[PDB]
Symmetry: D2
Subunit: 198 residues, 4 copies
């Protein structure tokens, strides 16, 4: 079975950057949608695998990636956010940011960059490229997962799907994206960071 994470703060705790109406729905109506369909599909995909049924296995695949990836994209997100989060990453992570984007503000535009240009629905990502032992920004389509689709390890991800900001910023994706920095829980983005080791 797969289950919906409780988010590490109330809905309320990310005001004013992200309002609680958006957190209310992102977690409960949105993320829960994916977990449940992940479950129905994975269910169906251990049945069809078992029969060796390669066309219904291939047919259950976009379903599996949308909800699969939609479950794990949004599960990393809540953790990347926190009220006593925010500011700039201390220590090691910061230094890697410095070593790879030149400076934290250069790193910040480079990620607003990726995120603000997702044509349609998708995500912006600060990832880790462990074959090259460095940071790496990537943007992903729909709920297409960073590691499931590129092999890069997710440290920080930004949802730019309209359901993530619209009820608040309306058409202005980059306003959302500016608010977002203030709740970025660098203490966890670092934990993910450290996990990766050279």
């Amino acid at each position: 079975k797969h289950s919906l994470p409780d988010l590490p703060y109330d809905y309320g705790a990310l005001e004013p950057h992200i309002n609680a109406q958006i957190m209310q729905l992102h977690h409960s109506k949105h993320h829960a949608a994916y977990v449940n369909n992940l479950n129905v599909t994975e269910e169906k995909y251990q049945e069809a695998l078992a029969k060796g049924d390669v066309t219904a296995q291939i047919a259950l695949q976009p379903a599996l990636k949308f909800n699969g990836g939609g479950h794990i994209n949004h599960s990393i997100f809540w953790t990347n956010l926190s009220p006593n989060g925010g500011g700039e990453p201390k220590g090691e992570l910061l230094e890697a940011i410095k070593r790879d984007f030149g400076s934290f503000d250069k790193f910040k535009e480079k990620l607003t960059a990726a995120s603000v240009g997702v044509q349609g629905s998708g995500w912006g990502w600060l990832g880790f490229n462990k074959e090259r032992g460095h940071l790496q920004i990537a943007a992903c389509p729909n709920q297409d997962p960073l590691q499931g689709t590129t092999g890069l390890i997710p440290l920080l991800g930004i949802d730019v799907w309209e359901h993530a900001y619209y009820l608040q910023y309306k058409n202005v994706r980059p306003d959302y994206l500016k608010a977002i920095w203030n709740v970025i829980n660098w203490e966890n983005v670092t934990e993910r960071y450290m996990a990766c080791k050279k």
Copy 2:
């Protein structure tokens, strides 16, 4: 130059199905975004064509389709909607619907079908397949145009991009999709229809 169509009714005129806050923004902040970037890109793409510069031509391509298709997808949409629109297509169009989906409610389910399943951002489409002289439902990704990407002729399209319903239906795409029928200006969907001739 490309210019933003005025929509054929005030924002207000599609209440309660689509509220005027949504119409206000879809036309003004959203569609206008695409026209203007269409223009900057087409500008740049007659410069680079002129230099025979095939890599910057290929680079301006997703930009051109997003805003190109985003301009023409949304320009057909306003025309497919009207207050004294709605109900059931009379005459010829209805009959083709009957001949191709069996009945208008079978046709309606088949198009909610397409639309409600757009993984991510995209559109549901009642099109015309002129190589086979019949109707044809198609769903398109992002602002990927029906005829620019499939050759099918657009008669009726439904935006299922979240920016089309979210401020009102929130996570409930199919509620939007049920409201939508009541403003469907069949008189124009028919005009597009007739244009196609066998």
Copy 3:
């Protein structure tokens, strides 16, 4: 376990249309490659499913579709070919061809059409669209299966991957495509046809 079909004729039996060097390799070196990797992957995909491991499940997906689809695309192919095959489809199938493409020669160009324009590697397909009870030509990318990716039922498929003709027609895909008609086992393309029933 998945196993390689024996092909229903010797390599030799499709001369001169397709030479036996090509049949030798298509079946033995090519198709067998896919079956074996289908097996290793499906193996790995019942392990990771079992652990509920959604990122390695999503990572095994292009592997599964390439070899999955590559196994079932090529398994339908051999059956669509035969020496005492060829000519035009008798009875019902022919009539559906007449009803959907106007005539067998109109149907033949419409399928050379699809096949000859596969940008890169892929397949041309005479399929069945069972939601609309009619024939339907479709072209698929790489070893992307007709029914696994579109829901259409495969009656006749043409490989236009270069490995299918190159050792013989070299750069001339459409020469291959003309030869191909002469070995088209219409007796089986019909059996697939009939299976579909309205």
Copy 4:
């Protein structure tokens, strides 16, 4: 007008690695195909741009990228190959290879890696990522150009489209890929390299 480059050696000059039957056809029948269709399409695309005809512009797009990118992918290729080419990149380029893949054999494996895994038709690429001032291996689909589609600068590319090796290595892509090293004209791959400057 666009014109076919003469290749910098006779067909013959890359034996035994790539045979002259393959060079004969790659340059003459294959690359020439793309130049000519580039030309017809670019022609049509300055007509339709001129009329502001956004759906026929979007329709001429896959045509333009296939032949556009197919023209420029194959034009860089001939230059990356030479008889008095081969071996090990001297100086600066070598050092960047050392700095980015650890060693030239690690770099070689990493690029056979990319190339040998192109599902279907495509290319493996040693590129330059000028926003990060370093080397970067990328693999591209069909004739999808490195810089036109990723912004990375092409220094060395390997065609793994079957038309590049099949008449010689048949199903064995990696044999082709091993032969390939021996004709790699490092003197030019370096010139492209140096052009990029930090």
